[PDB]
Amino acid sequence: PLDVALKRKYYEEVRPELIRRFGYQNVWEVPRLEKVVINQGLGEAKEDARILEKAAQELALITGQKPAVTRAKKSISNFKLRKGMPIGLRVTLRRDRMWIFLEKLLNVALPRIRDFRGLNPNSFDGRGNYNLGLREQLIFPEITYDMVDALRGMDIAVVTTAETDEEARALLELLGFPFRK
Amino acid sequence: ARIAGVEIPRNKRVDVALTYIYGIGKARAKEALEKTGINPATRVKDLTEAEVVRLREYVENTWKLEGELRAEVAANIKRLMDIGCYRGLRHRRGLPVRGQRTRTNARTRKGPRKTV
Amino acid sequence: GKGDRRTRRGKIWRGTYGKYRPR
Amino acid sequence: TMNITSKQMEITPAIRQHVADRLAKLEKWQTHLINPHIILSKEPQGFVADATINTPNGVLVASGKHEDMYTAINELINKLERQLNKLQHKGEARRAA
Amino acid sequence: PRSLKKGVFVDDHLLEKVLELNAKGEKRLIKTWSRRSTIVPEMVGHTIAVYNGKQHVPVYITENMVGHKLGEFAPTRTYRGHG
Amino acid sequence: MKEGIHPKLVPARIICGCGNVIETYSTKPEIYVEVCSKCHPFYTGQQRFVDTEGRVERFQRRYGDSYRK
RNA sequence: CGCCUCCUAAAAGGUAACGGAGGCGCCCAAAGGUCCCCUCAGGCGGGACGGAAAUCCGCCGGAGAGCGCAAGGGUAGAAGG
RNA sequence: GGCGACACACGUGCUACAAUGCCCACUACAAAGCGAUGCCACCCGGCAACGGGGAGCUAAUCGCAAAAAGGUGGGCCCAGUUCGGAUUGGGGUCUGCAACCCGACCCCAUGAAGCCGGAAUCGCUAGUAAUCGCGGAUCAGCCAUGCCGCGGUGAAUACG
Ligand SMILES: [Mg+2]
Ligand SMILES: [Mg+2]
Ligand SMILES: [Mg+2]
Ligand SMILES: [Mg+2]
Ligand SMILES: [Mg+2]
Ligand SMILES: [Mg+2]
Ligand SMILES: [Mg+2]
Ligand SMILES: [Mg+2]
Ligand SMILES: [Mg+2]
Ligand SMILES: [Mg+2]
Ligand SMILES: [Mg+2]
Ligand SMILES: [Mg+2]
Ligand SMILES: [Mg+2]
Ligand SMILES: [Mg+2]
Ligand SMILES: [Mg+2]
Ligand SMILES: [Mg+2]
Ligand SMILES: [Mg+2]
Ligand SMILES: [Mg+2]
Ligand SMILES: [Mg+2]
Ligand SMILES: [Mg+2]
Ligand SMILES: [Mg+2]
Ligand SMILES: [Mg+2]
Ligand SMILES: [Mg+2]
Ligand SMILES: [Mg+2]
Ligand SMILES: [Mg+2]
Ligand SMILES: [Mg+2]
Ligand SMILES: [Mg+2]
Ligand SMILES: [Mg+2]
Ligand SMILES: [Mg+2]
Ligand SMILES: [Mg+2]
Ligand SMILES: [Mg+2]
Ligand SMILES: [Mg+2]
Ligand SMILES: [Mg+2]
Ligand SMILES: [Mg+2]
Ligand SMILES: [Mg+2]
Ligand SMILES: [Mg+2]
Ligand SMILES: [Mg+2]
Ligand SMILES: [Mg+2]
Ligand SMILES: [Mg+2]
Ligand SMILES: [Mg+2]
Ligand SMILES: [Mg+2]
Ligand SMILES: [Zn+2]
């Protein structure tokens, strides 16, 4: 396994502070990151130019991991949806890769966001998970102006072993997630 | 997204290119290129990351810009509209604010021609 | 530009002076 | 579009529209009635309805006079019809020799 | 607008009426025909009735409405739209 | 992981405008970025960037006290 | 006017009326055989463009979904994917 | 307070849509008029509008004064732009008892429509048309892009 700064920060700084703050009686009870699942709802590639191999490339540069395709569960009229149509990507980051992604999200991506005023305090799942959406992929250090044909955002799910929101805010905050309020 | 949030046109002279930022006209343009000692004649595609960060650093720190400049203009109008002054009224109808005649013309505020 | 106050040519037209056409 | 002037008189949107209705009689000839102008006025002896209209082949200028405003508006229309029809068919007058 | 050099303009005759209200401990409606007058920091919290040409219009004066004139908040034209 | 479909991650230095250098991992070895967390206003205490205004308006005009009483 | 499904049909089968309601006259080269794997609808909470409903995360959720087409029977310990 | 309204419609015009052009700078050549709580050189402050100083002149003397297109040099490189300058935020100057309705000017920011205009329709036959600036009457200031004049450079075309 990789030594990555954020992973270390978790074990060294965050683990203890948390146990202090909630008084856990077991090492396994203290909150862990489980998975970061990144999604591209897309579907601007429904019929059009389902060469979103361009996006799969962009996403694979961002995560270091090749996304897999999502296709429609049912046919839909008003959105123009034949069932089985390729309308999104999803990459499930775990372990070392999850950490590296977050490391740069937290250090570099979020900072580059336009008029960034902090992550949303209320986007907490209510079972201790957090979700946030991006509008553009130029936020990541790996995707330059030169390489992009068009602006597309994404959905980020960060999944946690905490049972409650209240614990999750703590873990995520301590790790360095910047919250507006 | 170079300065500041916007990727200013390469292939252009820095004095001109900077004008492509919301909040920077001819004036503020010539001003920054002096305060950071760079040649206006230098094509943006020819700037040292050094020259660049000098430009970036100054400009973002001395003048309110892009989204924050707009927010204020919004906030200014926001309040003018809510206090109920006469300039607020003209905003509340999308009409002209600076005493212009509205029997004819006034098309930029009104939008193009609306049927009767 | 005759309608652009912010030039030389503007200020000749409006019959005025300033930073952009000084006396 | 069509413009009506009421000189030293107050007239209703009804009366205004009635003028549009009588003028449409001119659409019969199927040519462009360009910026038609109707003027209504009350002389001592009865109302006057004047109109000036340009069409691709010329101008219609004419005037009605009657104790009754509606009747004058009509007489205006006749004069306008006759002129308009003279415009539209005078050209045909000499295809031989 | 009115030069920074010259004064801030209030009609004198309104200011006296304001100041008199400050001393005795305010507050009643002040009828005035002075649209020209600046709202002034000591006017804050009154409700002055401003003339438009027909009506004397109630304006509660607030902290945010301070540099603006008196007539700015008693409109002169009735307009509910066309047709 | 499956071979042949994934961009290799290698040690990588992201160079920010504050002159910060971050030792992390990427599909690209060296990166230059305009900003980072270390120098970003929202992050950095509460760096009130260009407007340290104190509003400034509206009571706060004060030009001046010269109208009589 | 032949054929299918339900009811009438009186808890085996069968059972009429110009009785009550619907369907067929095709289709699939996979929509067939087998091995392996997977599990739904829906509700709530969370998430850029994105909406009642596209894709993503969480918790609940035995089958109310699916099963080419009518209906019925059947069926996730799969016949579904 | 209104005459300055504003779903709309018409007439007159201004400024443009750009390279025969646009910006910066350096440098030339008019005429007619106007000017005593009037025009104001020159000096100073301010990016500037302007402010403070302050000489001349009842004016073929003194001043408004710079004419502009032009010329020399430099940038722009065909992009809704170094085109266009509408709209809007903010900050000032002046006149005036007083600029909310409703003045003009300056400066920062904003930077619209507009890529040469359907039906239709105007002017002008020579120092004319086109283009360019300067004055005046009214007038505290000014919505003058209007009006009356003045010169600069200066065509095309008329079978009939
Ligand atoms: Mg929440
Ligand atoms: Mg959890
Ligand atoms: Mg990038
Ligand atoms: Mg700009
Ligand atoms: Mg008006
Ligand atoms: Mg311009
Ligand atoms: Mg007549
Ligand atoms: Mg023709
Ligand atoms: Mg049969
Ligand atoms: Mg039976
Ligand atoms: Mg039975
Ligand atoms: Mg039976
Ligand atoms: Mg039986
Ligand atoms: Mg049997
Ligand atoms: Mg039968
Ligand atoms: Mg049948
Ligand atoms: Mg198959
Ligand atoms: Mg099968
Ligand atoms: Mg098979
Ligand atoms: Mg579900
Ligand atoms: Mg939802
Ligand atoms: Mg949304
Ligand atoms: Mg949804
Ligand atoms: Mg079923
Ligand atoms: Mg069917
Ligand atoms: Mg009038
Ligand atoms: Mg028109
Ligand atoms: Mg005009
Ligand atoms: Mg005069
Ligand atoms: Mg533009
Ligand atoms: Mg356009
Ligand atoms: Mg431009
Ligand atoms: Mg062009
Ligand atoms: Mg033309
Ligand atoms: Mg032209
Ligand atoms: Mg035209
Ligand atoms: Mg002649
Ligand atoms: Mg021109
Ligand atoms: Mg003039
Ligand atoms: Mg005058
Ligand atoms: Mg005006
Ligand atoms: Zn930094």
Residue D33 makes CB contacts below 8 A (sequence gap 6+) with D2, D23, D26, D27, D53, D55
- In three state form, how does the secondary structure of F1-69 look? CCCCCCCCCEEEEEECCCCCEEEEEECCCEEECCCCCCCCCCCCCCCCCCCCCCCCCCCCCCCCCCCCC
State both tokens at F45: 């205490």
For residues D56 and D31, the answer to whether their CB atoms sit within 8 Å is: yes
For the CA of D57 and the C1' of H17, the distance in angstroms is 33
Q: CB pairs under 8 A, 24+ apart, for F30-38?
A: F31/A141, F31/A142, F32/B49, F33/A108, F33/A112, F33/A141, F34/A112, F34/B1, F34/B2, F34/B3, F34/B56, F35/A111, F35/A112, F36/A107, F36/A108, F36/A111, F37/A106, F37/A107, F37/A108, F37/A110, F37/A111, F37/A176, F37/A178
User: What Å resolution does this PDB entry report?
Assistant: 2.8
Distance CA B44, CA A51 (A): 33
Residue F40 Ramachandran class (φ > 0 left, ψ -120 to 50 alpha, else beta): beta
Give me the phi and psi of A31, to 5 degrees please. -40, 130
- CA–C1' nearest nucleotide, residue B100: H4
Largest CA distance in chain C: 20
Residue whose entry in the numeric block shows the structure tokens 């006296």: E16
Is there a contact between E63 and F59 if contact means CB atoms under 8 Å apart?
yes
Q: Would you tell me which residues 21-60 of chain F have a C-beta closer than 8 angstroms to some C-beta of chain B?
A: 32, 34, 49-51
Taking the Cβ of residue E36 and every Cβ of chain B, the question of whether any pair is shorter than 8 Å is answered with no
Q: In terms of residue numbers, what domain contains E26?
A: 1-83
Q: Does B87 touch chain E (CB under 8 A)?
A: yes
Q: E21: Cβ–Cβ under 8 A, 6 or more apart, which residues?
A: E27, E28, E30, E46
Amino acid residing at D16: R
Count CB neighbours of A70 within 10 A: 17
A125, A131 contact by CB (below 8 A): yes
Which residue(s) pair with D6 in the sheet? Answer: D40
Closest residue of chain B to A113, computed from CA coordinates: B5
* Among A111, A126, A112, A102, CA closest to A34: A102
Distance of A147 CA from G58 C1′ (whole Å): 35
Question: DSSP string covering A117-141, please?
Answer: --B-TT-B-SSS-EEEEES-STTST
Instruction: Identify whether the C-beta of residue D50 lies closer than 8 Å to the C-beta of residue D41.
Output: yes
Strand order of the β-sheet with D34-43 is D3-7, D34-43, D46-55, D58-66
Task: Report how far apart the first and last C-alpha atoms of chain C are (Å, whole number).
Answer: 20
CB E4 within 8 Å of CB F62: no
Name the structure determination technique. X-ray
Number of domains in chain E: 1
D22-26, long-range: CB < 8 A, 24+ apart: D22/D73, D22/D74, D22/D77, D23/D51, D23/D77, D23/D80, D25/D77, D25/D81, D26/D53, D26/D77, D26/D80, D26/D81, D26/D84
The CA angle A173-A141-F30, to the nearest 5 degrees, is: 115
Closest CA to F37 of A150, A5, A158: A5
- Protein CA F69 to sugar C1' G8 (Å): 104
Whether the CB-CB separation of E37 and E69 falls below 8 Å is answered with: yes
Pairing mode, if any, of strands F21-26 and F10-15?
Answer: antiparallel
Q: Is A107–F43 a contact, with Cβ atoms under 8 angstroms apart?
A: no
Instruction: Determine how many CB atoms are found less than 10 A away from the CB of residue B72.
Output: 14
The domain that contains E12 carries what CATH number?
3.30.860.10
d(C-alpha D2, C-alpha D23), whole Å: 10
Helix (H, G, I), strand (E, B) or coil at B10: coil
Which bases of chain H come closer than 7 Å to a protein CB?
1-11, 14-16, 22-25, 47-50, 65-66, 68, 75-77, 81-96, 98-113, 119-121, 132-135, 143, 145
Query: From the CB of residue E68, how many other CB atoms can be counted at a distance below 10 Å?
Result: 20
CB contact (8 A) between residue B1 and residue A145: yes
A135, A151 in Cβ contact below 8 A?
yes
Locate tokens 């507050």: which residue?
A: E27
Q: What angle do CA F51, F54, F56 make, to 5 degrees?
A: 90
Torsion angle in degrees (nearest 10) through CA of D66, D67, D69, D71: -50
DSSP D57: T
**Which nt sits closest to C19, CA to C1'?**
H48
Phi, psi of A129 (to 5 degrees): -130, 155
Strand stretches in chain A, DSSP E: 33-40, 68-71, 86-93, 130-134, 154-160
Residues A6 and A176: their CA atoms lie apart, in Å, by 9
Nearest ligand to the C-alpha atom of residue B107: 27
Segment holding D48, helix H or strand E: strand D46-55
Enumerate the H helices of B1-100 as residue ranges: 14-19, 26-35, 49-62, 66-83, 86-92
The SS3 of residue D35 is strand
